[PDB]
Amino acid sequence: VETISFSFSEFEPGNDNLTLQGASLITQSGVLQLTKINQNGMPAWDSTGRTLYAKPVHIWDMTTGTVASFETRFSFSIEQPYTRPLPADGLVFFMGPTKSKPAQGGGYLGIFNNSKQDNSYQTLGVEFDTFSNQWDPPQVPHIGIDVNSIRSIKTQPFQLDNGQVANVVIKYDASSKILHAVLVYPSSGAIYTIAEIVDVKQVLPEWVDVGLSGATGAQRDAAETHDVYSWSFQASLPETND
């Protein structure tokens, strides 16, 4: 069994295990800020940030025909300082081609370029969407499972606990091909669950980069914070199949 795993109970500036892109920055207080926050202390608009684990992950193996199972957990908070103009755009956990660079910002969350369904993206993502785009269901925010498209194959609306910490657990079981995700708000006790069938060998390349990405709106003040406090991941790939 080829296994990989990392756990950041806190983030440290200078940690070479993480690759920061765009506006993503680690504060001295140990918080990962995906999108920029101006000196006046308010979130900046038109900001896109990502953080990738410095090493690629082996998710499936063509030779043996094995697919890995995996689980990731992280804590984040989104503070929407104003009700108007509408806040945007959200954050997303994703897996895609290695050596990837940020894609389009805004409603594309830094991981897509358009709203088309395209295999070439070879990207899987679990979004926490705060703005209702044209391809989106009317309810926001919502959790979404994205497969080679910003247009989700499935969504679950949830209520935002403004500025409160949210706990997320995403698990993928290779044998059943089920990707189940959960979001819990300790502050209010709210529990949200969402699941869908995802055949990662048909979607992702054998080796993938794993990361988090966030973005704020293109309109002035259409912004919010996207803070991550802790993040862990573990993947197990059976090396053989007899």
Ligand SMILES: OC[C@H]1O[C@H](O)[C@H](O)[C@@H](O)[C@H]1O
């Ligand atoms: O107002 C913010 C809004 O700006 C544009 O409409 C973008 O397409 C959206 O993703 C969102 O960022």
Ligand SMILES: [Ca+2]
């Ligand atoms: Ca959206």
Ligand SMILES: [Mn+2]
């Ligand atoms: Mn969406």
